[PDB]
JSON list of C-alpha atoms and ligand atoms in Angstrom, two decimals:
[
{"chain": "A", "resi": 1, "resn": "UNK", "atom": "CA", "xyz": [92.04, 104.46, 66.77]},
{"chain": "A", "resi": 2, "resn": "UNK", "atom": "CA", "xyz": [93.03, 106.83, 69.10]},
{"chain": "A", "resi": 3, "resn": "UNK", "atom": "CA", "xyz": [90.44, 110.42, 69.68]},
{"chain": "A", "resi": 4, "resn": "UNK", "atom": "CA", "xyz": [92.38, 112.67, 72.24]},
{"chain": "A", "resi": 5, "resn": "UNK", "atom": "CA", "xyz": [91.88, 115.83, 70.06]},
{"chain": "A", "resi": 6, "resn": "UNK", "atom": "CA", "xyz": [89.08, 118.33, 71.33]},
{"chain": "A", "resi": 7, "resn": "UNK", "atom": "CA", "xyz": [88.71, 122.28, 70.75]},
{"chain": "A", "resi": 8, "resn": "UNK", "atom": "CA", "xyz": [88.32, 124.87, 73.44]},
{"chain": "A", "resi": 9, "resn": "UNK", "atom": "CA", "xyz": [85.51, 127.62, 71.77]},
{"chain": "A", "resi": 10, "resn": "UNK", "atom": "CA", "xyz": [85.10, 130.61, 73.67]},
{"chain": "A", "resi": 11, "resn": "UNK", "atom": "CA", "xyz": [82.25, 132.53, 72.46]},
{"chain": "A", "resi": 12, "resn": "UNK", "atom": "CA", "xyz": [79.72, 134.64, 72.49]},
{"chain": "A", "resi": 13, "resn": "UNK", "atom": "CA", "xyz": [75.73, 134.15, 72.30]},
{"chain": "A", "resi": 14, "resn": "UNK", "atom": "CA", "xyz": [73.51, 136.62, 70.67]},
{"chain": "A", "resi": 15, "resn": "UNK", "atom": "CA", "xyz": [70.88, 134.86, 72.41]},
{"chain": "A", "resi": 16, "resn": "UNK", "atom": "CA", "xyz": [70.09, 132.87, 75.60]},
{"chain": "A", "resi": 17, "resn": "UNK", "atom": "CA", "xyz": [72.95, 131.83, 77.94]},
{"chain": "A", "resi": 18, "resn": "UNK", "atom": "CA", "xyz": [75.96, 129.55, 77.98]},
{"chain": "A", "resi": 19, "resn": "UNK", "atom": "CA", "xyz": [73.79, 126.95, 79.71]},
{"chain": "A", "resi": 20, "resn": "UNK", "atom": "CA", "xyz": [71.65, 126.37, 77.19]},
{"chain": "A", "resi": 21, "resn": "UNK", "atom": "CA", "xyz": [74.31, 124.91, 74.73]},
{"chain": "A", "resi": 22, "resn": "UNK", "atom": "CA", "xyz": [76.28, 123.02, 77.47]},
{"chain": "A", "resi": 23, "resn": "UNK", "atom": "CA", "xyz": [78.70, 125.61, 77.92]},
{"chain": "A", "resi": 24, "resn": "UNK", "atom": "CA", "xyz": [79.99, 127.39, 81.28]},
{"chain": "A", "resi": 25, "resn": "UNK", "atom": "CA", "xyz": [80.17, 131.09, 81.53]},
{"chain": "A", "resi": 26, "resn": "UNK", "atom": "CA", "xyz": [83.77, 132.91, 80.54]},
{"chain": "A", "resi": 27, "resn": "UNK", "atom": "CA", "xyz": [83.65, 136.16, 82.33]},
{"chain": "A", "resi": 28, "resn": "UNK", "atom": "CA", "xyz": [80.84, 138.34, 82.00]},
{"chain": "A", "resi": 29, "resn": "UNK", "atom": "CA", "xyz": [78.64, 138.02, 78.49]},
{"chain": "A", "resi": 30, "resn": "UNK", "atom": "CA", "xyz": [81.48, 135.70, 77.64]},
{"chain": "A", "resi": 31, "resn": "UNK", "atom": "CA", "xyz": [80.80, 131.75, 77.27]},
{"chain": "A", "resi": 32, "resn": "UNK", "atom": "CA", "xyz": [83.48, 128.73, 76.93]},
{"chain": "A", "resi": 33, "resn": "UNK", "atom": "CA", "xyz": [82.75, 124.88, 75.86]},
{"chain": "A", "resi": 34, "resn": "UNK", "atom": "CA", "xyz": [85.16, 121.86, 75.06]},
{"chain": "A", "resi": 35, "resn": "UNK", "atom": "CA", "xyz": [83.80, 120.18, 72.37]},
{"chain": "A", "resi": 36, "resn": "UNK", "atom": "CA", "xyz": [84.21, 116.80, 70.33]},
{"chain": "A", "resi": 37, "resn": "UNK", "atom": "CA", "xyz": [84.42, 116.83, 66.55]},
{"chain": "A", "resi": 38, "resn": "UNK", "atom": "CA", "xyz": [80.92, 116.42, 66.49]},
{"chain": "A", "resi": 39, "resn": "UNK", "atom": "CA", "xyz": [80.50, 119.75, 67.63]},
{"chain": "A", "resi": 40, "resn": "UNK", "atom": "CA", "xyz": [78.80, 119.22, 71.14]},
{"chain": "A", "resi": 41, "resn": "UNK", "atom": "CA", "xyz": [79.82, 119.22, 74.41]},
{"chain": "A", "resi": 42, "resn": "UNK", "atom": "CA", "xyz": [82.18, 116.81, 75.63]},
{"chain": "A", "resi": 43, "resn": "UNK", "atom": "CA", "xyz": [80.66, 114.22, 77.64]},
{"chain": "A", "resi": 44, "resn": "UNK", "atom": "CA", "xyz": [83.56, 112.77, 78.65]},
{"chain": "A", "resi": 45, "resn": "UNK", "atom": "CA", "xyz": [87.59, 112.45, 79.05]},
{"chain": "A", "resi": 46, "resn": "UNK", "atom": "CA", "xyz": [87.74, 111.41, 75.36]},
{"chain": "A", "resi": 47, "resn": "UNK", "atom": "CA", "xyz": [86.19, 112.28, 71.68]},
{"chain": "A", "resi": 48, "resn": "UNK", "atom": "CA", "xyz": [85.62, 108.35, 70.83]},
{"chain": "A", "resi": 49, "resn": "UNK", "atom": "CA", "xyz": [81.95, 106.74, 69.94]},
{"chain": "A", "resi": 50, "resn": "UNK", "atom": "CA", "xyz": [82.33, 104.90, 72.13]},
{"chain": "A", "resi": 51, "resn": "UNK", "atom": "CA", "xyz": [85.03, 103.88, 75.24]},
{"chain": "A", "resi": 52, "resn": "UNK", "atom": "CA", "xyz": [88.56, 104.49, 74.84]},
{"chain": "A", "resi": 53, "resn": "UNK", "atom": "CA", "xyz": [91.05, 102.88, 77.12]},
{"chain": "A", "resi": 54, "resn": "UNK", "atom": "CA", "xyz": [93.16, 105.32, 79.67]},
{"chain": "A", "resi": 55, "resn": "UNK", "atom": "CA", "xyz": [95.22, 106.54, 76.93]},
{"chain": "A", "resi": 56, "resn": "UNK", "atom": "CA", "xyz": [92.71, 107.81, 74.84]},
{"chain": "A", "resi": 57, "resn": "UNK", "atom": "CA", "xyz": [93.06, 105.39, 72.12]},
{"chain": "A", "resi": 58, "resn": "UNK", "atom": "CA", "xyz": [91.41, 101.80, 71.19]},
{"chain": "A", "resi": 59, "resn": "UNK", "atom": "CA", "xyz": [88.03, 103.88, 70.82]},
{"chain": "A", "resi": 60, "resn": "UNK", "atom": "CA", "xyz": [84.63, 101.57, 70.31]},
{"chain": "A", "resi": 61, "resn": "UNK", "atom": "CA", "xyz": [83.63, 103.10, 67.27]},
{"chain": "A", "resi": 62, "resn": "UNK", "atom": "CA", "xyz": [86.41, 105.08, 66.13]},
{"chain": "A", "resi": 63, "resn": "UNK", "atom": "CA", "xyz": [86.39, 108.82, 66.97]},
{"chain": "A", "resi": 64, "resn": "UNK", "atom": "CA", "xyz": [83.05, 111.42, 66.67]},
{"chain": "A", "resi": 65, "resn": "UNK", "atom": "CA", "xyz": [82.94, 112.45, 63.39]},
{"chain": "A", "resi": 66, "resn": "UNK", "atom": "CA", "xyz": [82.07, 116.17, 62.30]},
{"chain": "A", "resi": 67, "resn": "UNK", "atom": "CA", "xyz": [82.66, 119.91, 61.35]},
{"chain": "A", "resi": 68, "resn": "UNK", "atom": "CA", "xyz": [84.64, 120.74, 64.61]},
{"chain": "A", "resi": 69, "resn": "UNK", "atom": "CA", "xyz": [83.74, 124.36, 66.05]},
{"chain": "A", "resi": 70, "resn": "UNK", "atom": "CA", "xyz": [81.96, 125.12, 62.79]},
{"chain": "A", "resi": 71, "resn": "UNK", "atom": "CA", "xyz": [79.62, 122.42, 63.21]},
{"chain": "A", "resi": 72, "resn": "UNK", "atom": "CA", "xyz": [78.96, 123.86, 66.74]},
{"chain": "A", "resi": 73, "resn": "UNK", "atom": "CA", "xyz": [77.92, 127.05, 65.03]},
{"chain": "A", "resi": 74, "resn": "UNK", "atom": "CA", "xyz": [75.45, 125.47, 63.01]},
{"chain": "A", "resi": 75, "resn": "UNK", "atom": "CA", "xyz": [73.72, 123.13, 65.46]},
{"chain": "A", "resi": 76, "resn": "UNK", "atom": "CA", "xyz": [73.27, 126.08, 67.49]},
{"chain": "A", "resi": 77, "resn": "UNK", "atom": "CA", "xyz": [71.80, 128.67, 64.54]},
{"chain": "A", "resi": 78, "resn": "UNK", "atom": "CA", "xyz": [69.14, 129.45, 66.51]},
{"chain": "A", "resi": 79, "resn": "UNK", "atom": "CA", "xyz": [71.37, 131.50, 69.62]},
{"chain": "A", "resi": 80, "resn": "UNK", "atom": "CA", "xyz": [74.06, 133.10, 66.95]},
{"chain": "A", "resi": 81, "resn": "UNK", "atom": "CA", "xyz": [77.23, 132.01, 68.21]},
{"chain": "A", "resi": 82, "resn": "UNK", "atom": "CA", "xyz": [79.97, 134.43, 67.69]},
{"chain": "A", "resi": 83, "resn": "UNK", "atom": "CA", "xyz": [83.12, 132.56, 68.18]},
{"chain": "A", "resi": 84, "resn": "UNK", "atom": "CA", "xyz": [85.99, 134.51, 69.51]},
{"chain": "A", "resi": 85, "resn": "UNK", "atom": "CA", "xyz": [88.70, 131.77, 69.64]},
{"chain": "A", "resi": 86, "resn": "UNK", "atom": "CA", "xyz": [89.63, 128.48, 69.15]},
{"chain": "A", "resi": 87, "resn": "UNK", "atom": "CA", "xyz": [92.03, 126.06, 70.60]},
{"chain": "A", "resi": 88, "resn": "UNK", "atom": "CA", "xyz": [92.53, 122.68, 69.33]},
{"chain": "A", "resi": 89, "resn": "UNK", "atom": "CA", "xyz": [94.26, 120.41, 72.07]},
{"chain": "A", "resi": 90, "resn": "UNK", "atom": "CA", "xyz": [96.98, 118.60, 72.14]},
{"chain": "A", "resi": 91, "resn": "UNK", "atom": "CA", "xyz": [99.05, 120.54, 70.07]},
{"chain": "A", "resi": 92, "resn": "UNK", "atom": "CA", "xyz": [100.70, 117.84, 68.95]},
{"chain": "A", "resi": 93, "resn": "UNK", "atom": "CA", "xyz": [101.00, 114.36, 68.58]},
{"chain": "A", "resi": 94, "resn": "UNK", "atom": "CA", "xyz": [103.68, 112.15, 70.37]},
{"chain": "A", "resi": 95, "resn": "UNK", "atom": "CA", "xyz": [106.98, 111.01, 69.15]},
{"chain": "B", "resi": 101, "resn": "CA", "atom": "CA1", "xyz": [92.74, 105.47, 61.88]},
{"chain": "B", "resi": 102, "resn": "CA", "atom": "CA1", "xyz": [83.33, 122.38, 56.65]}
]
């Protein structure tokens, strides 16, 4: 199984600061985060349960499992997180 996909959310917070959900500032009153499907914070190169090899794929586990952005939403209720875009990376697949 290969996990290589990942969403860029840039957002806003109705309250608290980007910090507080793992996310960096994006200008002022503007937040951004790359997250797994799991909706949280990357914590690493790659979206698997576990360790992927260098090309992303062979993950331990398969890949974290969720709603994407929208689950990022809702684990975060409690600062109201306005989403102004979303990117999900790569684009595409090879071949
Ligand atoms: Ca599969
Ligand atoms: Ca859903």
């Amino acid at each position: 199984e290969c996990c290589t996909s990942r969403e860029l959310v840039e957002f806003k917070m109705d309250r608290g600061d980007c910090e507080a959900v793992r996310a960096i500032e994006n200008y002022p009153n503007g937040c951004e985060v790359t997250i797994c499907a799991d909706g949280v914070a990357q914590l690493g190169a790659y979206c698997g349960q576990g360790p992927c090899n260098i090309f992303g794929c062979n993950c331990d586990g398969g890949c974290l499992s969720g709603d994407w952005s929208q689950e990022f939403v809702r684990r975060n209720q409690q600062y109201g997180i306005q989403i102004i875009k979303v990117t999900r990376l790569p684009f595409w697949r090879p071949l």
